[PDB]
Ligand binder design. Structure first.
Ligand SMILES: *[C@H]1O[C@H](CO)[C@@H](O[C@H]2O[C@H](CO)[C@@H](O[C@@H]3O[C@H](CO)[C@@H](O)[C@H](O)[C@@H]3O)[C@H](O)[C@H]2NC(C)=O)[C@H](O[C@@H]2O[C@@H](C)[C@@H](O)[C@@H](O)[C@@H]2O)[C@H]1NC(C)=O
Ligand SMILES: *[C@H]1O[C@H](CO)[C@@H](O[C@H]2O[C@H](CO)[C@@H](O[C@@H]3O[C@H](CO)[C@@H](O)[C@H](O)[C@@H]3O)[C@H](O)[C@H]2NC(C)=O)[C@H](O[C@H]2O[C@@H](C)[C@@H](O)[C@@H](O)[C@@H]2O)[C@H]1NC(C)=O
Ligand SMILES: *[C@@H]1O[C@H](CO)[C@@H](O[C@@H]2O[C@H](CO)[C@@H](O)[C@H](O)[C@H]2NC(C)=O)[C@H](O[C@@H]2O[C@@H](C)[C@@H](O)[C@@H](O)[C@@H]2O)[C@H]1NC(C)=O
Ligand SMILES: *[C@@H]1O[C@H](CO)[C@@H](O[C@@H]2O[C@H](CO)[C@@H](O)[C@H](O)[C@H]2NC(C)=O)[C@H](O[C@H]2O[C@@H](C)[C@@H](O)[C@@H](O)[C@@H]2O)[C@H]1NC(C)=O
Ligand SMILES: *[C@@H]1O[C@H](CO)[C@@H](O[C@@H]2O[C@H](CO)[C@@H](O)[C@H](O)[C@H]2NC(C)=O)[C@H](O)[C@H]1NC(C)=O
Ligand SMILES: *[C@@H]1O[C@H](CO)[C@@H](O)[C@H](O[C@H]2O[C@@H](C)[C@@H](O)[C@@H](O)[C@@H]2O)[C@H]1NC(C)=O
Ligand SMILES: *[C@@H]1O[C@H](CO)[C@@H](O)[C@H](O[C@H]2O[C@@H](C)[C@@H](O)[C@@H](O)[C@@H]2O)[C@H]1NC(C)=O
Ligand SMILES: *[C@@H]1O[C@H](CO)[C@@H](O)[C@H](O)[C@H]1NC(C)=O
Ligand SMILES: [Fe+3]
Ligand SMILES: [Fe+3]
Ligand SMILES: [Mn+2]
Ligand SMILES: [Mn+2]
Lengths: 424, 426
């Protein structure tokens, strides 16, 4: 309630159409493949594993000669479900700020796409990031995506806050709905990388049907550039793109002191260089600050361990999803507590980041309407409406954030904020 | 912090001696194998995997007819280390409260041990649990264990709070020190089950030497009865023994709402029956209450999510380690906070368990001496001294806890508390 089977787009929806041709490459998507940006991971799925299905042809537009690469293939099973042949190809050492064309398939199944590598990492290098979370595959989900595509701000990459397909809401977590989501999202992710964050809907824990190990479907379908970041797990990693250093954290993985993620995270903080990448961005599914009734305080555990660091290294902004609505905080912190002093009230803090909740992509569960009352002072803006966001970096000191509602024009900003870098 | 290579017992120490005979079964240890208690998991390691090395012969003291079982074998690698053949045999459906003999090996390598299954689960069934945490393999570690063995209270099983071998403190986490620890602890774990709790020293995360996946050594050496508990992971599970229902949690695994462990834990709480097993015990490595300087507030994250439940289901007592010293709290809680009300002060709460910190088994890192000041009211007793503890269940309403320091006689109690069950005496 709402029932996924009643609100998600129909199986026959155009957006779920299978590309024609024998063994057509489908569910095509890419993501950054290296730490610097001249890398990419291209993913595509094929119903059969026959000669040719595992090859990518790519080439810069202003350089005729085309190179070919082979992917690594995998398949997985989940209850009575079996995947097709999933290919993942990691291409490195490309050129910065250059358009590339790549194609999959052969005969009349051949498909061509393109993408643009980001400019070399630098302090004043501008870049426009799209912001989406908890999209799923409902009719609202389609609207949200449509609006992002038409947004005059022209996003070059999407920072995704978690909860991709919501297929776990179907009987037996029907993995066929992961495939549909793959076809649906392809029109975007096939052209610009989506930087993944794992949400609780990617856990896919189902003892009832004998599936006790989490993230099996997600981990097999959406690889991450964790190794290049120094992480031995795909759920947590970091990349550098343009003037930003992005750290993606995992809400449902262990994160207390001494845990692998914690050790990786602290080391990563020390690798950050604000002189090269001014904008320090963090992604986590569950918000550390949320004043909505839904999932209220669920992020308290992580806030206890990580907030102190967010503030010490001066993260500029933190993006989260999970709560199906929108919210933006004031720069605040609650890191003075030691039990005895009883100091447990969030206070204005210019060394703290702005906290964003954008889990309103439109998944089947619907909007999270009820809010705590009255509005806490740490909250600057909160509205329950589907939409997407934009983080527009202009230079080392300015970046413009904005929220776009589906009721409004793709370019209309219902809320926005000009951020001043915390370091410059 | 002290150098492990300078304080841990020497490689040639008697306590590390390899049993004689061809392919001698070594590093023998057992733990409960089922949910009820009539189960056991026997583990032993053999340098070679030849016919016979994978068989256990076991029988009742009363019987003369001995049974035989085959184990499941595994080996693992860690950096430039390779394990021998590790065997794990899960024997089920034994008889309650009966002594059993079992033997491994052949020829003059043959070795015999014994253990005693617990009595059938019941409200007034008495039982004595030993308490140890962060023991490691130093000379103090040996003393601690010796004292437990001589303790007139006669513990029948050991609840272990985490951080077993501390071999990760040696160069490259030298897994050879896991083997030594296995021989050292054997004199006890081979006769009475140790109920494992995973500590940060079992994480064995070492990117520097290309080991990114945690718990590899621990998970391969010390199996857990998680499946019989409904858990798909060895780091978290529950068992019933005598009058107690024990829930073992994992501090370094995900534990927030919606996580596998969290879902397992909440379901497990609903399976608890205080009319069958009065004593609800919880084990976690990192203490939710600790007033020592070391690791101060490290357990705050878990307290935020789990404390509310500990109080609602009235856990009787919670045992932890991690802090190398001893501490016992008053029955308190801090579950009223909602941000806005600013209610963040621990307050006296008779519905809350007593929190115990016994990570003073004696590992190489030494004692955690500095304490926060002055002593917070939620703390009833705190002392930095090596030792072990005893949880003596007498009946559905009374259970006696006591702390034993290595400076004192195995039986001397430097601290103690008579607990009143929260369900039948509170
Ligand atoms: C693994 O097992 C699944 C068990 O749920 C199965 O789901 C389907 O199971 C049956 C078999 O097709 C479907 O059909 C109904 O079955 C009942 C049996 O009592 C019968 O009386 C009805 O007349 C009706 O035919 C179920 O509808 C369905 N489960 C549900 C409710 O979603 C999976 O197989 C499936 O079979 C068909 C339903 C296909 O259309 C797919 O849904 C699927 O293939 C099976 N795994 C797979 C291959 O998905
Ligand atoms: C189960 O739980 C308690 C564990 O020992 C047990 O102890 C209490 O009872 C003991 C006597 O039965 C008492 O000690 C005795 O004191 C007399 C007095 O002179 C002496 O002769 C004996 O040699 C013993 O020393 C313990 O002090 C007492 N424990 C405390 C301090 O709480 C419970 O005993 C209860 O049993 C009742 C039937 C009744 O005797 C109660 O008064 C007693 O507390 C025991 N409970 C049950 C169900 O038997
Ligand atoms: C694993 O790598 C270690 C070094 O990275 C090896 O240990 C080194 O062994 C040298 C001679 O064997 C010695 O001079 C070095 O000081 C020593 N360094 C260390 C880690 O202390 C190790 O080889 C083992 O060394 C010890 C542990 C011996 O007892 C034997 O177990 C081995 O010789 C390497 N493990 C391998 C490949 O067996
Ligand atoms: C919880 O555990 C107790 C102890 O095993 C169960 O009690 C049963 O019924 C009486 C109640 O006092 C008790 O004296 C018996 O020793 C015990 N007998 C059994 C095993 O049935 C208790 O009840 C269970 O059995 C009966 C009473 C049934 O109606 C229902 O209450 C339950 O199945 C156990 N309750 C549970 C399973 O949650
Ligand atoms: C999802 O929204 C898109 C808009 O981006 C819809 O795309 C239209 O698709 C039809 C074919 O079905 C094309 O002829 C139009 O040109 C597309 N319009 C746009 C604006 O691109 C799509 O139909 C929607 N899908 C569903 C199932 O509602
Ligand atoms: C942060 O990025 C700067 C631009 O790329 C770079 O200049 C900084 O390095 C500075 O200190 C050292 C490393 C020196 O070699 C020189 O590159 C600069 O003065 C860099 N910060 C660091 C320490 O890596
Ligand atoms: C960084 O981008 C900002 C957003 O477009 C832009 O306003 C900043 O320029 C401003 O500089 C200051 C000195 C102000 O007086 C005026 O000149 C501009 O608005 C720009 N910062 C840079 C690169 O100077
Ligand atoms: C450990 O203690 C035992 C007796 O408890 C003793 O025999 C042995 O020598 C001790 N080991 C060492 C080397 O400390
Ligand atoms: Fe969601
Ligand atoms: Fe320890
Ligand atoms: Mn979510
Ligand atoms: Mn520890």
């Amino acid at each position: 309630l709402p029932n996924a089977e009643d609100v998600d787009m129909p199986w026959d929806s155009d957006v779920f159409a299978v590309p024609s041709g024998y063994n057509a490459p489908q569910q095509v998507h890419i993501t950054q493949g290296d730490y610097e940006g001249r890398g990419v991971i291209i993913s595509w799925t094929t119903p059969y594993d026959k000669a040719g299905a595992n090859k990518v042809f790519y080439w810069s537009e202003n350089s005729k000669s085309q190179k070919r690469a082979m992917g690594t293939v995998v398949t997985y099973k989940y209850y009575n479900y079996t995947s097709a042949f999933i290919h993942h190809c990691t291409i490195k050492d490309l050129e910065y700020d250059t358009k590339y064309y790549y194609r999959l398939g052969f005969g009349d199944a051949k498909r061509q796409f393109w993408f643009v590598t980001p400019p070399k990492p630098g302090p004043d290098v501008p870049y426009v990031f799209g912001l989406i979370g908890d999209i799923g595959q409902t009719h609202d989900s389609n609207t949200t995506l449509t609006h992002y595509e038409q947004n005059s701000a022209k996003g070059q990459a999407v920072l995704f806050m978690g909860d991709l397909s919501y297929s776990n809401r179907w009987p037996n977590h029907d993995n066929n709905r992961w495939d549909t989501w793959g076809r649906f999202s392809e029109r975007s992710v096939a052209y610009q990388p989506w930087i993944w964050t794992a949400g609780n809907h990617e856990i896919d824990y189902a003892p009832d049907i004998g599936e006790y190990q989490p993230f099996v479907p997600f981990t097999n379908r959406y690889p991450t550039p964790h190794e290049a970041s120094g992480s031995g797990d795909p759920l947590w990693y970091a990349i550098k793109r343009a003037s930003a250093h992005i750290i993606v954290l995992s809400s449902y993985s262990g994160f207390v002191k001494y845990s692998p993620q914690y050790k990786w995270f602290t080391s990563e903080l020390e690798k950050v260089n604000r002189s090269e990448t001014p904008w320090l961005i963090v992604l986590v599914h569950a918000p550390l600050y949320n004043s909505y009734e839904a999932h209220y305080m669920e992020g308290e555990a992580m806030r206890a361990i990580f907030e102190p660091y967010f503030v010490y290294y001066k993260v500029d902004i933190v993006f989260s999803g999970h709560v199906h609505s929108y919210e933006r905080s004031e720069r605040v912190s609650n890191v003075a507590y030691n039990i005895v002093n009883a100091k447990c009230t969030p206070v204005s803090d210019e060394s703290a980041p702005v906290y964003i909740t954008i889990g309103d992509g439109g998944n089947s569960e619907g909007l999270a309407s009820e809010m705590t009352q009255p509005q806490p002072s740490y909250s600057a803006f909160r509205e329950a409406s589907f939409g997407h966001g934009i983080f527009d970096i202009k230079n080392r000191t300015h970046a413009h954030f904005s929220w776009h509602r589906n009721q409004d024009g793709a370019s209309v900003e219902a809320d926005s904020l000009w951020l001043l870098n915390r370091y410059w």
